[PDB]
């Protein structure tokens, strides 16, 4: 059922920096996630141009932000491409590795925090606001898998036997006990209006 | 030998508005097309950590920027992932119908043409400084292809045979008389530490 793995050294060192600096602009975190749900429907979408089969998962190409506060999560679901067991293990899709240190260079030479979607591991920001993250995902060639974190310098992977959910990923963050604000609709509209207003899907704020 | 494509009936309409928009800050194109080389730079490296022989054609990742007043060219070669025919024909890889409604209506609301990269279709702003744009382009699965067009509605797509590429694109810009300043050292390499600084693969500005 259950495997553990340890994030590679440069990805541990990555989320350490993310978790321990200072660093007050944290709602950059819902942006970065955002553009990679942008990014893997965009994927699927350039894949159904010649091959429509790749949609009988599902037609629609969306983002919905999901928060609730009784389990103090808000969760980012998009139908884009999802990632195969491979993926996950691989850093999520990411070339982490190379943007880590493309990213700790960046930050030598004057860029800050905000800017680590342009070095590919803007998924990592998530640990700006979350003790753990957990990510379901369904890619067309292979099953529903769970990989989760609370970072500390390793990772699980499951087959998901939860809720189906066709293609895509769900990125739930479980907030930590002082980010409560980006569970607020007012909070989480006036940042997606900010940062993310011309994304060319639609994204849906859930209601509670 | 040449076979020749009409562009769709969006790309058509897209280039005619980069074409013939008053908009004085063109250097932006060269931003988008490094931007694009990176991309494709990062998806050979992901391919690689799971199968290495994806190197065979190349293990350097690199972005050479080539100025040539003879020919009144500059030229952005990288060693990236490439693209198959299918691939070039397909608006080159890039999901352009979509990418130019959401870019149009982005257009409505606000924006302007230096945010076109956000919508996936930054490539054609080549055409703020190009009479004609030439593309090489060859990838792990295919030959190597030439596409060109000078817009007008049409493209051509042939076998290459000039000089074995390896693995990569190379978008040759053949610059309108008037935009010429882009083949001046000084001026590119102000434009790449303004807009290209912390692109994650060295980018080498060749000298004449
Ligand atoms: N939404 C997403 N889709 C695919 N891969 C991802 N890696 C991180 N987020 C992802
Ligand atoms: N440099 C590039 N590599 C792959 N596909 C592209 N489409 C446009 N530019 C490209
Ligand atoms: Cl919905
Ligand atoms: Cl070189």
Same mark, same amino acid.
């Given at each position: 059922? @259950?495997?553990?793995?340890?994030?590679?050294? &440069?990805?541990?060192?990555?989320?350490?920096?993310?978790?321990?600096?200072?660093?007050? $602009?944290?709602? !950059?975190?819902?942006?970065?996630?955002?553009? $990679?749900?942008?990014?893997?429907?965009?994927?699927?979408?350039?894949? =159904?141009?010649?091959?429509?089969? *790749?949609?009988? =998962?599902? *037609?629609?190409?969306?983002?919905?932000?999901?928060?609730? *506060?009784?389990?103090?999560?808000?969760? !980012? +679901?998009?139908?884009?491409?999802?990632?195969?067991?491979?993926?996950?293990? %691989? %850093?999520?899709?990411?070339?982490?590795?190379?943007?880590?240190?493309?990213?700790? &260079?960046?930050?030598?030479?004057?860029?800050?925090?905000?800017?680590?979607?342009?070095?590919? @591991? #803007?998924? /990592?920001?998530?640990?700006? +606001?979350?003790?753990? +993250?957990?990510?379901?995902?369904?890619?067309?060639?292979? &099953?529903? /898998?769970?990989?989760?974190?609370?970072?500390? #310098?390793?990772?699980?992977?499951?087959?998901?036997? #939860?809720?189906?959910?066709?293609?895509?990923?769900? @990125?739930?963050?479980?907030? *930590?006990?002082?980010?409560?604000?980006?569970?607020?609709?007012?909070?989480?509209?006036?940042?997606?209006?900010?940062?993310?207003?011309?994304?060319?899907?639609?994204?849906?704020?859930?209601? &509670?």
């Amino acid at each position: 059922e @259950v495997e553990t793995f340890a994030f590679q050294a &440069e990805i541990a060192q990555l989320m350490s920096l993310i978790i321990n600096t200072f660093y007050s $602009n944290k709602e !950059i975190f819902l942006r970065e996630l955002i553009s $990679n749900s942008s990014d893997a429907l965009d994927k699927i979408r350039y894949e =159904s141009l010649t091959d429509p089969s *790749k949609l009988d =998962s599902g *037609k629609e190409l969306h983002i919905n932000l999901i928060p609730n *506060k009784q389990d103090r999560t808000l969760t !980012i +679901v998009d139908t884009g491409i999802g990632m195969t067991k491979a993926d996950l293990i %691989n %850093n999520l899709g990411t070339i982490a590795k190379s943007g880590t240190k493309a990213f700790m &260079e960046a930050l030598q030479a004057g860029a800050d925090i905000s800017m680590i979607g342009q070095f590919g @591991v #803007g998924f /990592y920001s998530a640990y700006l +606001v979350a003790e753990k +993250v957990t990510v379901i995902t369904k890619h067309n060639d292979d &099953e529903q /898998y769970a990989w989760e974190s609370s970072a500390g #310098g390793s990772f699980t992977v499951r087959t998901d036997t #939860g809720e189906p959910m066709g293609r895509g990923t769900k @990125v739930i963050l479980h907030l *930590k006990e002082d980010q409560t604000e980006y569970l607020e609709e007012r909070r989480i509209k006036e940042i997606v209006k900010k940062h993310s207003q011309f994304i060319g899907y639609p994204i849906t704020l859930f209601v &509670e």
